C-alpha cells in the first residue's frame, strides 16, 4: 500500500536554505510520499530563495499530498528560510488541517567549529 | 595539604609553650608537613605547575623562618634542624 | 569522613526477583569495603525526561554512605560499566 497510503495525519517537512527551498510531505512516523523543490519547477538561483517560490512549491507538494489523501499535517521548520513565514498560510489555504506548528532549528551545543569565512 | 587533625597534633608536639600556636618551630614543622604532602602529590601528578608554585612559596617561607631562627637562637635551631632531618 | 549520596537507574525490563537481587547486591558491594550505608531508599517508578538508550523509564533509588574517599566510586566505576542492567548512576558529596 506504499504508493496509495490512506492517512489524513502526517507531518509537513519544509526546508528553506538562503538559496533553495525543499518541501516534502511525510506520514506521522515520517514516510515520504512526494516532495517539491524550487529546482524541480524551473526556479533557478535567486528566484529559488524568493518566498513565493517556496509558497508555490508548497502548493505543488500539497497537490500530490492529497492526491493519495491527506487532511491534517504538522509543520516542521528547519533552518533560516525566506519562504517559511507564508508557508503555513500556504498549506492551510491549500485545503489542509494543520494542527501543530513546530520550529526545529538544529542548534549544535558547540560541537564543531563553523566555517570561518562566508 | 594536611588534614586539620594532623596539623593540630604537629603543633601539639612541636610547641614551645602550652599556649603557643605560631612560632618558628611550629611553623617550620607544619610547613615541612605540607611540603611533603605537596611533594607526594607532584610525584603522582607531574604536570601540575600551579601547585608547584605554591610549593615553592612554602619552601621559601620555611627557609626564611629557618634563617630567622638560626640568626635568633642557634641552639634551638640546631636541635630543630635534625628533629625533621632537613638542611644538610 | 564524607557522605556520598549515590542514586542509580535500573531498567524496567528486569523481573522483581532480579531487581531485588540487584539492589541488595549493589548495597552490599558498596558497603563491603568499609563503607556503612546510612540510608538506602527506593524512590521507585518515575518517568524519565529522555529515553536513555531505548528504555522509556527506570527505577530511581538512593543510597547514602559515609566512608573514606575511595570506597564508593571504586567498584561502581567498573561494575556499573560492565553491568548492562544499570544505565545511569552518579555519586555526589555533602
Amino acid at each position: 500500500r506504499r504508493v496509495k497510503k490512506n492517512i489524513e495525519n502526517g507531518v509537513a517537512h519544509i526546508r528553506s536554505t538562503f538559496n533553495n527551498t525543499i518541501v516534502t510531505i511525510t506520514d506521522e512516523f515520517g514516510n515520504a510520499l512526494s516532495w517539491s523543490s524550487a529546482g524541480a519547477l524551473g526556479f533557478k538561483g535567486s528566484k529559488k530563495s524568493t518566498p513565493f517560490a517556496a509558497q508555490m512549491a508548497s502548493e505543488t507538494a500539497s497537490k500530490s499530498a492529497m492526491e493519495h489523501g491527506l487532511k491534517t499535517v504538522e509543520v516542521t521548520v528547519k533552518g533560516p528560510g525566506p519562504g517559511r513565514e507564508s508557508a503555513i498560510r500556504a498549506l492551510q489555504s491549500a485545503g489542509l488541517e494543520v494542527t501543530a506548528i513546530r520550529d526545529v532549528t538544529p542548534v549544535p551545543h558547540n560541537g564543531c567549529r563553523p566555517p570561518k569565512r562566508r | 595539604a594536611i588534614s586539620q587533625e594532623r596539623k593540630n597534633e604537629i603543633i601539639k608536639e612541636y610547641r614551645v609553650h602550652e599556649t603557643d600556636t605560631g612560632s618558628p618551630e611550629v611553623q617550620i614543622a607544619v610547613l615541612t608537613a605540607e611540603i611533603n604532602a605537596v611533594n607526594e602529590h607532584l610525584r603522582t601528578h607531574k604536570k601540575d605547575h600551579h601547585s608547584r608554585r605554591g610549593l615553592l612559596k612554602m619552601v621559601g617561607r620555611r627557609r626564611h623562618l629557618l634563617n630567622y631562627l638560626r640568626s635568633k637562637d642557634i641552639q634551638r635551631y640546631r636541635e630543630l634542624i635534625k628533629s625533621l632531618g632537613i638542611r644538610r | 569522613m564524607r557522605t556520598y549520596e549515590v542514586m542509580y537507574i535500573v531498567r524496567p525490563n528486569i523481573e522483581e526477583d532480579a531487581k531485588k537481587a540487584l539492589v541488595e547486591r549493589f548495597n552490599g558491594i558498596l558497603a563491603t569495603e568499609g563503607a556503612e550505608v546510612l540510608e538506602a531508599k527506593d524512590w521507585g517508578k518515575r518517568r524519565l525526561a529522555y529515553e536513555i538508550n531505548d528504555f522509556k523509564d527506570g527505577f530511581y533509588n538512593i543510597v547514602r554512605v559515609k566512608s573514606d574517599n575511595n570506597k564508593a566510586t571504586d567498584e561502581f566505576q567498573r561494575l556499573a560499566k560492565i553491568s548492562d542492567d544499570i544505565i545511569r548512576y552518579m555519586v555526589i558529596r555533602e
Partner: protein, 58 residues
C-alpha cells in the same frame, strides 16, 4: 531562605526553567548570583540523571 538547592527536588528546578527546558536568566527569575550558580549546578546534575529534559517541545 532555602540556602541549599538539591537536584532531587524537581519542583524548584521546574519553577526556574524555560518552556524549552533551558535555564532562565537571572533577570527573568530575579534570584541572586550565588543561588543562580547553585541552581545551574543542580539543574545540570538533574539533567545528567534524565530527571530533566535537554530539549523539550512536545
Amino acid at each position: 531562605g532555602i540556602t541549599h538547592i538539591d537536584y532531587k527536588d524537581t519542583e524548584l528546578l521546574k519553577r526556574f526553567i524555560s518552556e524549552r527546558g533551558k535555564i532562565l536568566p537571572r533577570r527573568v527569575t530575579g534570584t541572586s548570583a550565588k543561588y543562580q550558580r547553585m541552581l545551574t549546578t543542580a539543574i545540570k546534575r538533574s539533567r545528567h540523571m534524565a530527571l530533566l529534559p535537554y530539549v523539550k517541545e512536545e
